[PDB]
Amino acid sequence: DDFAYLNARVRVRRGTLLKESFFQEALDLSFADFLRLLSETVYGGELAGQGLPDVDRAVLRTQAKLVGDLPRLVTGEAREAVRLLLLRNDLHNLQALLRAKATGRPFEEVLLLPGTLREEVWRQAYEAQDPAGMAQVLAVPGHPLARALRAVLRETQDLARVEALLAKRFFEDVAKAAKGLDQPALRDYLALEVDAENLRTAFKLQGSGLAPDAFFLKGGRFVDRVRFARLMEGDYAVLDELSGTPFSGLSGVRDLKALERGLRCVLLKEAKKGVQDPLGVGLVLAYVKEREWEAVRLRLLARRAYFGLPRAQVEEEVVC
């Protein structure tokens, strides 16, 4: 462990982060001009065709090389900390894949965050014949989500419950690994990720009649068991009671889309606090999250330009 060498490599990578004016110009371009603007960034080195799927592939391959290689640059404790960040992105990816598969979204529209598994592993998991085949695909590289998915599917096959319990189980495992590190920035970010997952789980399971304690994740900071239970009962005022916390901007949120938007913005702002940290995981955490948000926004704006959607239909989604 230490982050000195990694940090110096990352400060050089941050020089290729896309600036805000990229995203502001892109809102008003045709798809040809979007492609041109993209070709002048670091993503242009992976842009191999002129169609929408080519932009998505250019994003995936670029992020693989600028983020997915990070654990190779550190060892011991520092490597464990970086690995946890990427694993949390594998959890996002599996959740996104399950929901796509269940709801009729093709694999090509699934947002894959930079993680520890190759794209072809996710495609194979999507394509598998049944959930057993999906788990075996994850088990070949020995990924810990394979066992977690098996354990959750034994208990329930309802999509929203499977997503919630998979997160619960992942964060319960991350917590044991994370407790063995001493990274104050990671401790603050993890506590906020727990609060956020609790809020999304409570919102999604609202009115199902479930007992909240099977679903509540410990380890948070601002979202207590009683508010989680109240929101899972259908009390939306919980989202209005968070003044004085990082979640105070959730006030007035009354749909999942606006929730997930709000949550991503809260976590990005928190990840940004550590960009100038000389010690520990803060700078790599900030860099990974900024690259995540860059990928999310590139895919949305690529679609807006390709299909010619109005700017107001998408601007709210790409700004915090």
Coordinates of all heavy atoms in Angstrom, one line a residue, residues 242-312:
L242 N -34.4 15.7 4.9 CA -32.9 15.5 4.9 C -32.1 16.8 4.8 O -30.9 16.8 4.4 CB -32.5 14.5 3.8 CG -33.2 13.1 3.8 CD1 -33.0 12.3 2.5 CD2 -32.9 12.3 5.0
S243 N -32.7 17.9 5.3 CA -31.9 19.2 5.3 C -30.7 19.0 6.2 O -30.7 18.2 7.1 CB -32.7 20.4 6.0 OG -33.1 19.9 7.3
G244 N -29.7 19.8 5.9 CA -28.5 19.7 6.7 C -27.7 18.4 6.4 O -26.8 18.1 7.2
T245 N -28.0 17.7 5.4 CA -27.2 16.5 5.0 C -26.9 16.6 3.5 O -27.4 17.5 2.8 CB -28.0 15.1 5.2 OG1 -29.0 15.0 4.1 CG2 -28.9 15.2 6.5
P246 N -26.1 15.7 3.0 CA -25.8 15.8 1.5 C -27.0 15.5 0.7 O -27.0 15.8 -0.5 CB -24.7 14.7 1.4 CG -24.0 14.7 2.7 CD -25.2 14.8 3.7
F247 N -28.0 14.9 1.3 CA -29.2 14.5 0.5 C -30.3 15.6 0.6 O -31.5 15.3 0.1 CB -29.8 13.1 1.0 CG -28.8 12.0 0.9 CD1 -28.1 11.5 2.0 CD2 -28.6 11.4 -0.3 CE1 -27.2 10.4 1.9 CE2 -27.8 10.3 -0.5 CZ -27.0 9.8 0.6
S248 N -30.0 16.8 1.0 CA -31.1 17.7 1.2 C -31.7 18.1 -0.2 O -32.9 18.5 -0.2 CB -30.7 19.0 1.9 OG -29.6 19.6 1.1
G249 N -31.0 18.1 -1.3 CA -31.5 18.3 -2.6 C -32.5 17.3 -3.1 O -33.1 17.5 -4.2
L250 N -32.7 16.2 -2.4 CA -33.8 15.3 -2.7 C -35.2 15.8 -2.3 O -36.2 15.1 -2.7 CB -33.6 13.9 -2.1 CG -32.3 13.1 -2.5 CD1 -32.1 11.7 -1.8 CD2 -32.2 13.0 -4.1
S251 N -35.3 16.9 -1.7 CA -36.6 17.4 -1.3 C -37.5 17.6 -2.5 O -37.1 18.1 -3.5 CB -36.4 18.7 -0.5 OG -37.7 19.2 -0.1
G252 N -38.7 17.0 -2.5 CA -39.6 17.2 -3.6 C -39.5 16.1 -4.6 O -40.4 16.1 -5.5
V253 N -38.5 15.2 -4.5 CA -38.4 14.1 -5.4 C -39.6 13.2 -5.2 O -39.9 12.8 -4.1 CB -37.1 13.3 -5.3 CG1 -37.1 12.0 -5.9 CG2 -35.9 14.2 -5.9
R254 N -40.3 12.8 -6.3 CA -41.4 11.9 -6.2 C -41.4 10.8 -7.2 O -42.5 10.1 -7.4 CB -42.7 12.7 -6.2 CG -42.9 13.6 -4.9 CD -43.1 12.8 -3.6 NE -43.5 13.7 -2.5 CZ -42.6 14.3 -1.8 NH1 -41.3 14.2 -2.0 NH2 -43.0 15.1 -0.7
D255 N -40.3 10.6 -8.0 CA -40.2 9.5 -8.9 C -38.8 8.9 -8.9 O -37.9 9.6 -8.6 CB -40.7 9.8 -10.3 CG -39.9 11.0 -10.9 OD1 -38.9 10.7 -11.5 OD2 -40.4 12.1 -10.8
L256 N -38.7 7.7 -9.3 CA -37.5 7.0 -9.3 C -36.4 7.7 -10.2 O -35.3 7.7 -9.8 CB -37.7 5.5 -9.7 CG -36.5 4.6 -9.7 CD1 -35.8 4.4 -8.2 CD2 -36.9 3.3 -10.3
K257 N -36.9 8.2 -11.3 CA -35.8 8.7 -12.2 C -35.1 9.9 -11.6 O -33.9 10.0 -11.6 CB -36.5 9.2 -13.6 CG -35.4 9.5 -14.6 CD -36.0 9.2 -16.0 CE -35.1 9.7 -17.1 NZ -35.4 11.1 -17.5
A258 N -35.9 10.8 -11.1 CA -35.4 12.0 -10.4 C -34.6 11.5 -9.1 O -33.6 12.1 -8.8 CB -36.5 12.8 -10.0
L259 N -35.1 10.4 -8.5 CA -34.3 10.0 -7.3 C -32.9 9.5 -7.7 O -32.0 9.9 -7.1 CB -35.0 8.8 -6.6 CG -34.2 8.2 -5.4 CD1 -33.9 9.3 -4.3 CD2 -35.0 7.0 -4.8
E260 N -32.8 8.7 -8.8 CA -31.6 8.1 -9.2 C -30.6 9.2 -9.7 O -29.5 9.2 -9.4 CB -31.8 7.0 -10.2 CG -32.5 5.8 -9.5 CD -32.1 4.4 -10.1 OE1 -32.1 4.3 -11.4 OE2 -31.9 3.5 -9.3
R261 N -31.2 10.2 -10.4 CA -30.4 11.3 -10.8 C -29.8 12.1 -9.6 O -28.6 12.4 -9.5 CB -31.4 12.3 -11.5 CG -30.7 13.5 -12.2 CD -31.7 14.4 -12.8 NE -32.9 13.7 -13.4 CZ -34.2 14.0 -13.3 NH1 -34.5 15.1 -12.5 NH2 -35.1 13.3 -13.8
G262 N -30.6 12.4 -8.6 CA -30.2 13.1 -7.4 C -29.1 12.3 -6.6 O -28.2 12.9 -6.2
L263 N -29.3 11.0 -6.6 CA -28.4 10.2 -5.8 C -27.0 10.2 -6.5 O -26.0 10.3 -5.9 CB -28.9 8.8 -5.6 CG -30.1 8.7 -4.8 CD1 -30.5 7.2 -4.8 CD2 -29.7 9.1 -3.3
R264 N -27.0 10.1 -7.9 CA -25.8 10.1 -8.5 C -25.0 11.4 -8.3 O -23.9 11.5 -8.1 CB -25.9 9.8 -10.1 CG -24.6 10.0 -10.7 CD -24.6 10.2 -12.2 NE -25.5 9.2 -12.8 CZ -25.3 7.9 -12.8 NH1 -24.2 7.4 -12.3 NH2 -26.2 7.2 -13.4
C265 N -25.7 12.5 -8.4 CA -25.1 13.8 -8.2 C -24.6 14.0 -6.8 O -23.5 14.7 -6.6 CB -26.2 14.9 -8.4 SG -26.6 15.1 -10.1
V266 N -25.4 13.5 -5.8 CA -24.8 13.6 -4.4 C -23.5 12.8 -4.2 O -22.5 13.3 -3.7 CB -25.9 12.9 -3.4 CG1 -25.2 12.8 -2.0 CG2 -27.1 13.8 -3.3
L267 N -23.5 11.5 -4.8 CA -22.3 10.7 -4.6 C -21.1 11.3 -5.4 O -20.0 11.2 -5.0 CB -22.5 9.3 -5.0 CG -23.5 8.6 -4.1 CD1 -23.9 7.3 -4.6 CD2 -22.8 8.4 -2.7
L268 N -21.4 11.9 -6.6 CA -20.3 12.6 -7.4 C -19.7 13.7 -6.6 O -18.4 13.9 -6.6 CB -20.9 13.1 -8.7 CG -19.8 13.8 -9.6 CD1 -18.5 13.0 -9.8 CD2 -20.5 14.2 -10.9
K269 N -20.6 14.5 -6.1 CA -20.0 15.7 -5.3 C -19.2 15.2 -4.1 O -18.1 15.8 -3.8 CB -21.2 16.6 -4.8 CG -20.7 17.7 -3.8 CD -21.9 18.7 -3.5 CE -21.5 19.6 -2.4 NZ -22.5 20.7 -2.2
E270 N -19.6 14.2 -3.4 CA -18.8 13.6 -2.3 C -17.5 13.0 -2.9 O -16.4 13.3 -2.3 CB -19.6 12.5 -1.6 CG -18.8 11.7 -0.6 CD -18.7 12.4 0.8 OE1 -19.5 13.5 1.1 OE2 -18.0 11.9 1.6
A271 N -17.5 12.3 -4.0 CA -16.3 11.7 -4.5 C -15.3 12.8 -4.9 O -14.1 12.6 -4.8 CB -16.6 10.8 -5.8
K272 N -15.8 13.9 -5.3 CA -14.9 15.1 -5.7 C -14.1 15.8 -4.6 O -13.1 16.4 -4.8 CB -15.7 16.1 -6.4 CG -16.0 15.8 -7.9 CD -16.9 16.9 -8.3 CE -17.2 17.0 -9.8 NZ -18.1 18.2 -10.0
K273 N -14.6 15.6 -3.3 CA -13.9 16.1 -2.2 C -12.4 15.7 -2.1 O -11.6 16.5 -1.6 CB -14.6 15.8 -0.9 CG -15.9 16.5 -0.6 CD -16.6 15.7 0.5 CE -16.8 16.5 1.8 NZ -17.4 15.6 2.8
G274 N -12.1 14.5 -2.5 CA -10.7 14.0 -2.3 C -9.8 14.3 -3.5 O -8.7 13.7 -3.5
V275 N -10.1 15.0 -4.5 CA -9.2 15.2 -5.7 C -7.8 15.8 -5.3 O -6.8 15.4 -5.9 CB -9.8 16.2 -6.8 CG1 -10.8 15.6 -7.6 CG2 -10.3 17.5 -6.1
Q276 N -7.8 16.6 -4.3 CA -6.5 17.1 -3.9 C -5.9 16.4 -2.7 O -5.0 17.0 -2.1 CB -6.6 18.7 -3.6 CG -7.0 19.5 -4.9 CD -6.4 20.8 -5.0 OE1 -6.6 21.7 -4.1 NE2 -5.6 21.1 -6.1
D277 N -6.3 15.2 -2.4 CA -5.8 14.5 -1.2 C -4.4 14.0 -1.5 O -4.3 13.1 -2.4 CB -6.6 13.3 -0.8 CG -7.9 13.6 -0.2 OD1 -8.2 14.8 0.1 OD2 -8.7 12.6 0.1
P278 N -3.3 14.5 -0.8 CA -2.0 13.9 -1.1 C -1.8 12.4 -0.7 O -0.9 11.7 -1.3 CB -1.0 14.9 -0.3 CG -1.8 15.4 0.8 CD -3.2 15.5 0.2
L279 N -2.5 12.0 0.3 CA -2.4 10.6 0.8 C -3.8 9.9 0.6 O -4.8 10.5 0.4 CB -2.2 10.6 2.4 CG -1.0 11.4 2.8 CD1 -0.9 11.1 4.4 CD2 0.2 10.7 2.2
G280 N -3.7 8.5 0.5 CA -4.8 7.7 0.5 C -5.6 7.6 -0.8 O -5.2 8.2 -1.8
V281 N -6.8 7.1 -0.7 CA -7.6 6.7 -1.9 C -8.4 7.8 -2.5 O -9.0 7.7 -3.6 CB -8.5 5.5 -1.5 CG1 -9.6 6.0 -0.6 CG2 -9.0 4.7 -2.8
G282 N -8.4 9.0 -1.9 CA -9.3 10.1 -2.3 C -9.2 10.5 -3.8 O -10.1 10.8 -4.5
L283 N -7.9 10.6 -4.3 CA -7.8 11.1 -5.6 C -8.3 10.0 -6.6 O -9.0 10.4 -7.6 CB -6.3 11.4 -5.9 CG -5.8 11.6 -7.5 CD1 -6.8 12.5 -8.2 CD2 -4.5 12.2 -7.6
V284 N -7.9 8.7 -6.4 CA -8.4 7.7 -7.4 C -9.9 7.6 -7.3 O -10.6 7.4 -8.3 CB -7.6 6.3 -7.3 CG1 -7.9 5.5 -6.0 CG2 -8.1 5.4 -8.4
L285 N -10.5 7.7 -6.1 CA -11.9 7.6 -5.9 C -12.5 8.7 -6.8 O -13.6 8.5 -7.5 CB -12.3 7.8 -4.4 CG -13.8 8.2 -4.2 CD1 -14.6 7.0 -4.6 CD2 -13.9 8.3 -2.6
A286 N -12.0 10.0 -6.7 CA -12.6 11.1 -7.4 C -12.5 10.8 -9.0 O -13.4 11.0 -9.7 CB -11.8 12.3 -7.1
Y287 N -11.3 10.3 -9.3 CA -11.1 10.1 -10.8 C -12.1 9.0 -11.3 O -12.7 9.2 -12.4 CB -9.6 9.6 -10.9 CG -9.3 9.1 -12.3 CD1 -9.3 10.1 -13.4 CD2 -9.1 7.8 -12.6 CE1 -9.0 9.7 -14.7 CE2 -8.7 7.4 -14.0 CZ -8.8 8.4 -15.0 OH -8.6 8.1 -16.3
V288 N -12.2 7.9 -10.6 CA -13.1 6.8 -11.1 C -14.6 7.3 -11.2 O -15.3 7.1 -12.3 CB -13.1 5.6 -10.1 CG1 -14.2 4.6 -10.4 CG2 -11.7 4.9 -10.2
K289 N -15.0 8.0 -10.2 CA -16.4 8.6 -10.3 C -16.5 9.6 -11.4 O -17.6 9.7 -12.1 CB -16.9 9.2 -8.9 CG -17.0 8.2 -7.8 CD -17.7 6.9 -8.2 CE -17.1 5.7 -7.4 NZ -18.0 4.5 -7.7
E290 N -15.6 10.5 -11.6 CA -15.7 11.5 -12.7 C -15.7 10.7 -14.1 O -16.4 11.1 -15.0 CB -14.4 12.4 -12.7 CG -14.5 13.4 -11.6 CD -13.2 14.2 -11.3 OE1 -12.1 13.7 -11.7 OE2 -13.3 15.3 -10.7
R291 N -14.9 9.7 -14.2 CA -14.9 8.9 -15.5 C -16.3 8.2 -15.7 O -16.8 8.1 -16.8 CB -13.8 7.8 -15.5 CG -12.5 8.4 -15.8 CD -12.4 8.8 -17.4 NE -11.0 9.2 -17.7 CZ -10.5 10.0 -18.6 NH1 -11.3 10.7 -19.5 NH2 -9.2 10.3 -18.6
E292 N -16.9 7.7 -14.6 CA -18.3 7.1 -14.6 C -19.3 8.1 -15.1 O -20.1 7.8 -16.0 CB -18.8 6.6 -13.2 CG -18.0 5.5 -12.7 CD -18.5 5.1 -11.4 OE1 -19.6 5.5 -10.9 OE2 -17.7 4.4 -10.7
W293 N -19.2 9.3 -14.6 CA -20.2 10.3 -15.0 C -19.9 10.8 -16.4 O -20.9 11.2 -17.2 CB -20.0 11.5 -14.0 CG -21.0 12.7 -14.2 CD1 -20.6 14.1 -14.1 CD2 -22.4 12.7 -14.4 NE1 -21.7 14.8 -14.2 CE2 -22.8 14.1 -14.4 CE3 -23.4 11.8 -14.6 CZ2 -24.1 14.5 -14.6 CZ3 -24.7 12.2 -14.8 CH2 -25.1 13.5 -14.8
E294 N -18.7 10.8 -16.8 CA -18.4 11.1 -18.2 C -19.0 10.0 -19.1 O -19.6 10.4 -20.1 CB -16.9 11.2 -18.3 CG -16.3 11.6 -19.6 CD -14.8 11.6 -19.5 OE1 -14.2 12.7 -19.1 OE2 -14.1 10.6 -19.8
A295 N -18.9 8.8 -18.8 CA -19.5 7.7 -19.6 C -21.0 7.8 -19.7 O -21.6 7.6 -20.8 CB -19.1 6.2 -19.1
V296 N -21.7 8.0 -18.5 CA -23.1 8.1 -18.5 C -23.6 9.3 -19.4 O -24.6 9.2 -20.2 CB -23.6 8.4 -17.0 CG1 -25.0 8.9 -17.0 CG2 -23.4 7.1 -16.2
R297 N -22.9 10.4 -19.3 CA -23.3 11.6 -20.1 C -23.0 11.4 -21.6 O -23.9 11.8 -22.4 CB -22.6 12.8 -19.6 CG -23.1 13.4 -18.2 CD -22.5 14.7 -17.9 NE -21.1 14.5 -17.4 CZ -20.3 15.5 -17.2 NH1 -20.8 16.8 -17.4 NH2 -19.1 15.3 -16.8
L298 N -21.9 10.8 -21.9 CA -21.6 10.5 -23.3 C -22.6 9.7 -24.0 O -23.1 9.9 -25.1 CB -20.2 9.8 -23.5 CG -19.1 10.8 -23.3 CD1 -17.7 10.1 -23.3 CD2 -19.0 12.0 -24.4
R299 N -23.0 8.6 -23.3 CA -24.1 7.8 -23.9 C -25.5 8.4 -24.1 O -26.1 8.2 -25.1 CB -24.3 6.5 -23.0 CG -23.1 5.6 -23.0 CD -23.2 4.5 -22.0 NE -24.5 3.8 -22.2 CZ -24.6 2.6 -22.9 NH1 -23.5 2.1 -23.5 NH2 -25.8 2.0 -23.1
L300 N -25.9 9.2 -23.1 CA -27.1 10.0 -23.3 C -27.0 11.0 -24.4 O -28.0 11.2 -25.1 CB -27.4 10.7 -21.9 CG -28.1 9.8 -20.9 CD1 -28.3 10.4 -19.5 CD2 -29.6 9.5 -21.5
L301 N -25.9 11.8 -24.4 CA -25.8 12.8 -25.5 C -25.6 12.2 -26.9 O -26.0 12.8 -27.9 CB -24.7 13.7 -25.2 CG -24.9 14.5 -23.9 CD1 -23.6 15.2 -23.6 CD2 -26.0 15.5 -24.0
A302 N -24.9 11.0 -27.0 CA -24.8 10.3 -28.2 C -26.3 10.0 -28.7 O -26.6 10.2 -29.9 CB -24.0 9.1 -28.1
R303 N -27.1 9.5 -27.8 CA -28.5 9.2 -28.2 C -29.3 10.4 -28.6 O -30.1 10.3 -29.6 CB -29.2 8.3 -27.1 CG -28.6 6.9 -27.1 CD -28.7 6.2 -25.7 NE -28.3 4.8 -25.9 CZ -27.1 4.4 -26.1 NH1 -26.0 5.2 -26.1 NH2 -26.9 3.1 -26.3
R304 N -29.2 11.5 -27.9 CA -29.9 12.7 -28.2 C -29.5 13.2 -29.6 O -30.4 13.5 -30.4 CB -29.5 13.8 -27.2 CG -30.5 14.9 -27.4 CD -30.0 16.2 -27.3 NE -28.9 16.4 -28.3 CZ -29.0 16.8 -29.6 NH1 -30.2 17.0 -30.1 NH2 -27.9 17.0 -30.3
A305 N -28.2 13.1 -29.9 CA -27.8 13.6 -31.2 C -28.2 12.6 -32.3 O -28.6 13.0 -33.4 CB -26.3 13.7 -31.2
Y306 N -28.1 11.3 -32.1 CA -28.4 10.3 -33.1 C -29.9 10.3 -33.5 O -30.3 10.3 -34.7 CB -28.1 8.9 -32.5 CG -28.2 7.8 -33.5 CD1 -27.2 7.6 -34.5 CD2 -29.2 6.9 -33.4 CE1 -27.2 6.5 -35.4 CE2 -29.3 5.8 -34.3 CZ -28.4 5.7 -35.3 OH -28.5 4.6 -36.1
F307 N -30.8 10.5 -32.5 CA -32.2 10.4 -32.7 C -32.8 11.8 -32.9 O -34.0 11.9 -33.2 CB -32.9 9.7 -31.6 CG -32.6 8.2 -31.5 CD1 -31.9 7.7 -30.4 CD2 -33.0 7.3 -32.5 CE1 -31.6 6.4 -30.4 CE2 -32.7 6.0 -32.4 CZ -32.0 5.5 -31.4
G308 N -32.0 12.8 -32.6 CA -32.4 14.1 -32.8 C -33.4 14.6 -31.7 O -34.3 15.4 -32.0
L309 N -33.3 14.1 -30.5 CA -34.2 14.6 -29.4 C -34.0 16.0 -29.0 O -32.9 16.6 -29.0 CB -34.1 13.7 -28.2 CG -34.1 12.2 -28.7 CD1 -33.6 11.2 -27.6 CD2 -35.4 11.8 -29.3
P310 N -35.1 16.7 -28.5 CA -34.9 18.0 -28.0 C -34.0 18.1 -26.8 O -33.9 17.1 -26.0 CB -36.4 18.4 -27.5 CG -37.0 17.1 -27.3 CD -36.4 16.1 -28.3
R311 N -33.3 19.2 -26.7 CA -32.3 19.4 -25.7 C -32.9 19.3 -24.2 O -32.3 18.7 -23.4 CB -31.6 20.7 -25.9 CG -31.1 21.3 -24.6 CD -31.0 22.9 -24.7 NE -29.6 23.1 -25.1 CZ -28.7 23.7 -24.4 NH1 -29.1 24.1 -23.1 NH2 -27.5 23.9 -24.8
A312 N -34.2 19.8 -24.1 CA -34.8 19.8 -22.7 C -35.1 18.4 -22.3 O -35.2 18.1 -21.1 CB -36.0 20.7 -22.7

